[PDB]
């Protein structure tokens, strides 16, 4: 969405700061943009949670580089292998979605509990930095309840969008009720795809709080079978499961039947 020569100035602005104060290792320089003017906000003197997204478009392992820099290795040497500043660019577009316990059905309150099931993704450029969500492990309210970071990467913004959508739809976290359905709407948003959105984008778009009743029928039939196996069934004497007599079912083709003409067809002709 931003103009080409705008981001150059914002990058230069960052470089001018960090080079002026002899910065060592990885750091982020935050800004605030309006119209055509950079405004320095803060510096985060470490890696950020959302580093992957940039690692996917530039092609540099940021975390790896940190260790080597700390090891005293040179930025353009055999170890770090960093391209010259004029050689560093971005291939395609990458997006990162945050998945936390925080209820969208209850004013974003982190939830204490034990997960009953977790289900991953995979595919072309789909990073699944899993923290709290893996097995049947209980999570503590004391820690930032980061369940999963979810990152996708593609040459098209639209293609990175639909990559995120499918991954979001393939997710399955139960016990807790997550921010997923919300996030899918953001990815299918014409004003998100367009590029120009404010930090007020969410509040002024109320239909992003629109939840769909997505049933997990599989879970439901596992729950039914489980309940009946253990607790029995009303009016049914607790005994060994049938299919005692494996008497296989006689069958006739749809074709044959589609041709049959009897009293139904008669009604349709004569009344």
């Amino acid at each position: 969405g931003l103009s080409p020569t705008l981001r150059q100035r914002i990058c230069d602005a960052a470089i001018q700061l960090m080079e002026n104060i002899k910065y060592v290792n990885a750091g982020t320089v935050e800004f605030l943009v309006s119209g055509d003017e950079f405004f320095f906000i803060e510096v985060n003197p470490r890696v950020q949670v959302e580093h992957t997204i940039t690692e996917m478009v530039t092609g540099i392992d940021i975390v790896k580089t940190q260790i080597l820099v700390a090891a005293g290795a040179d930025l353009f040497g055999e170890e770090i292998n960093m391209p010259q500043q004029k050689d560093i660019t971005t291939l395609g577009y990458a997006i990162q979605c945050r998945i936390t316990t925080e209820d969208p059905l209850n004013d974003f309150m982190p939830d204490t509990g034990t997960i009953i099931a977790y289900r991953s993704s995979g595919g072309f450029g789909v990073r699944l930095d899993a923290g709290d969500g893996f097995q049947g492990a209980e999570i503590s309210p004391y820690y930032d309840s980061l369940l999963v970071k979810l990152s996708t990467h593609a040459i098209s913004f639209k293609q990175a969008e639909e990559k995120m959508v499918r991954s979001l739809r393939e997710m399955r976290i139960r016990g807790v009720k997550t921010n997923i359905p919300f996030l899918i709407n953001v990815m299918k948003n014409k004003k998100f795809t367009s590029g120009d959105y404010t930090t007020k984008f969410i509040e002024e778009t109320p239909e992003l709080f629109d939840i769909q009743p997505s049933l997990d029928r599989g879970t439901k039939t596992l729950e039914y079978i489980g309940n009946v196996t253990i607790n029995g069934f009303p009016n049914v004497e607790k005994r060994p499961k049938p299919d005692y007599e494996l008497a296989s079912i006689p069958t006739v083709s749809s074709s044959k039947i589609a041709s049959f003409s009897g009293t139904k067809q008669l009604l349709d002709e004569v009344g």
Binding site: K64, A71, D129, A130, A137, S140
Partner: protein, 66 residues
């Protein structure tokens, strides 16, 4: 010139760093709290050590001296 590296952290970032370190032939060390005895990150390292059993998992990752 680094031989073994400890992550003053937990979760996916710890795993990520261990992997980066392993790629550089660096031995790794994980710290875990009393509630992170089952955190995946504890296992994805060469060495595991408990951070204060007498200092609740609330405070553990922030106690500089231990």
């Amino acid at each position: 010139q680094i031989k073994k590296l400890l992550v003053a952290n937990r979760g996916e970032i710890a795993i990520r760093i261990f992997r980066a370190a392993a790629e550089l032939d660096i031995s790794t060390v994980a710290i875990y709290s009393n509630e992170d005895k089952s955190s995946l990150h504890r296992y994805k390292a060469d060495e595991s050590y408990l951070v204060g059993s007498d200092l609740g998992p609330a405070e553990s990752y922030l106690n500089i001296e231990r």
